Design an enzyme around this catalytic site. Sequence first.
Site, PDB file in Angstrom:
ATOM      1  N   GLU A  35       9.950 -42.801  10.247  1.00 35.24           N
ATOM      2  CA  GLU A  35      11.211 -43.028  10.116  1.00 35.24           C
ATOM      3  C   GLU A  35      11.817 -44.295  11.147  1.00 35.24           C
ATOM      4  OE1 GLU A  35      13.327 -42.254   7.831  1.00 35.24           O
ATOM      5  OE2 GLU A  35      12.504 -40.765   6.953  1.00 35.24           O
ATOM      6  N   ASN A  46      21.713 -48.483   3.616  1.00 33.59           N
ATOM      7  CA  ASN A  46      21.163 -48.163   2.178  1.00 33.59           C
ATOM      8  C   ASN A  46      21.946 -48.848   0.919  1.00 33.59           C
ATOM      9  OD1 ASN A  46      20.943 -45.303   3.627  1.00 33.59           O
ATOM     10  ND2 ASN A  46      18.926 -46.315   2.832  1.00 33.59           N
ATOM     11  N   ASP A  48      23.577 -47.778  -1.393  1.00 41.10           N
ATOM     12  CA  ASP A  48      24.861 -47.188  -1.484  1.00 41.10           C
ATOM     13  C   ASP A  48      25.834 -47.460  -0.642  1.00 41.10           C
ATOM     14  OD1 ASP A  48      24.010 -45.354   0.446  1.00 41.10           O
ATOM     15  OD2 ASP A  48      24.161 -43.646  -0.490  1.00 41.10           O
ATOM     16  N   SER A  50      25.556 -46.415   2.600  1.00 44.86           N
ATOM     17  CA  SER A  50      25.251 -45.723   3.767  1.00 44.86           C
ATOM     18  C   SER A  50      24.603 -46.253   4.731  1.00 44.86           C
ATOM     19  CB  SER A  50      24.936 -44.188   3.383  1.00 44.86           C
ATOM     20  OG  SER A  50      23.727 -44.151   2.568  1.00 44.86           O
ATOM     21  N   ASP A  52      21.409 -45.210   7.734  1.00 43.38           N
ATOM     22  CA  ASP A  52      20.651 -44.146   8.524  1.00 43.38           C
ATOM     23  C   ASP A  52      20.367 -44.753  10.018  1.00 43.38           C
ATOM     24  OD1 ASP A  52      19.938 -43.014   5.883  1.00 43.38           O
ATOM     25  OD2 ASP A  52      18.418 -44.539   5.889  1.00 43.38           O
ATOM     26  N   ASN A  59      21.469 -39.984   7.883  1.00 44.25           N
ATOM     27  CA  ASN A  59      22.383 -40.611   7.000  1.00 44.25           C
ATOM     28  C   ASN A  59      23.882 -40.501   6.993  1.00 44.25           C
ATOM     29  OD1 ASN A  59      23.636 -40.837   3.973  1.00 44.25           O
ATOM     30  ND2 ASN A  59      22.009 -42.470   4.339  1.00 44.25           N
ATOM     31  N   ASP A 101      19.204 -26.581   5.508  1.00 42.18           N
ATOM     32  CA  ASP A 101      20.052 -27.066   4.398  1.00 42.18           C
ATOM     33  C   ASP A 101      19.694 -26.524   2.867  1.00 42.18           C
ATOM     34  OD1 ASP A 101      22.733 -28.420   3.363  1.00 42.18           O
ATOM     35  OD2 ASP A 101      21.149 -29.858   2.838  1.00 42.18           O
TER      36      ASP A 101
END
EC number: 3.2.1.17
Length: 129
Positions: A35, A46, A48, A50, A52, A59, A101
């Site tokens: 990562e 990203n 979109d 967003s 990280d 995120n 989650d």
Amino acid sequence: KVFGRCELAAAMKRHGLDNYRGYSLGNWVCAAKFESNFNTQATNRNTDGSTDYGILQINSRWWCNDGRTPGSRNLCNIPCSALLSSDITASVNCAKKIVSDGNGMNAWVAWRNRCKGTDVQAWIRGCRL
Ligand SMILES: [Cl-]
């Protein structure tokens, strides 16, 4: 801060990640390697909109607030900047919420593509733990 492999393994063990939800320490070290290359200050934007953040590239759409991700949630209740600290507590605490989650560590695309199904114990080999 850029961690060494064994130094991160010991910090993660200390913060309760070894076998958290059934994922051995090697899994978390492997995910952090691919990562962020063990760099707490890693950020990646990203498509979109967003971003990280940090050693585990958590995120901004769901997990943290960065003030620039329209209609995002802040499920870990922290500014995303807190994920960039040399102290990994905030990242660890938020990671534990993510992996509970429902999709487990498959939430981390690098873990799924690079760690999952591999000999992850190699990541902690040689370390004093
Ligand atoms: Cl799972």
